Amino acid sequence: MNDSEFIQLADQLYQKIEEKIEESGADVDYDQNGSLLTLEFENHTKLIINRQQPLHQVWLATLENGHHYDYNNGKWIDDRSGDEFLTFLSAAIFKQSKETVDFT
Numbered sequence: 814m815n816d817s818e819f820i821q822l823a824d825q826l827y828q829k830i831e832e833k834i835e836e837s838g839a840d841v842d843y844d845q846n847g848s849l850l851t852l853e854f855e856n857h858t859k860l861i862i863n864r865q866q867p868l869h870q871v872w873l874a875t876l877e878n879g880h881h882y883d884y885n886n887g888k889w890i891d892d893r894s895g896d897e898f899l900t901f902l903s904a905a906i907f908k909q910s911k912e913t914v915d916f917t
């Protein structure tokens with residue numbers, strides 16, 4: 814994967830997260846600031862998603878831990894756990910808002 818393609822895939826990922834938040838009607842605020850996509854919940858907690866172009870990775874920061882994802886198999890995959898990014902994100906959103914956003 815080159816830089817231009819990573820950009821395409823990551824842009825699609827960010828729009829999908831934003832779109833699915835819209836489909837869901839969930840009370841999750843989103844703001845993209847450059848490479849960052851910040852999700853804020855009504856309890857003032859946050860999930861921060863960051864693009865790292867030179868590594869062709871997407872990074873997620875939860876309240877406890879950081880996670881780094883590769884595009885594998887048409888999906889974004891955690892490089893330690895093998896967990897898929899969007900399944901994991903749905904669960905994190907749920908833990909912090911108890912609202913439900915499906916990205917599948």
Ligand SMILES: [Eu+3]
Nearest residue numbers: 814815816818
């Ligand atoms: Eu190529």
Ligand SMILES: [Eu+3]
Nearest residue numbers: 834835838839
């Ligand atoms: Eu709206």
Ligand SMILES: [Eu+3]
Nearest residue numbers: 840841842855
């Ligand atoms: Eu609000």
Ligand SMILES: [Eu+3]
Nearest residue numbers: 844845846847
């Ligand atoms: Eu903005």
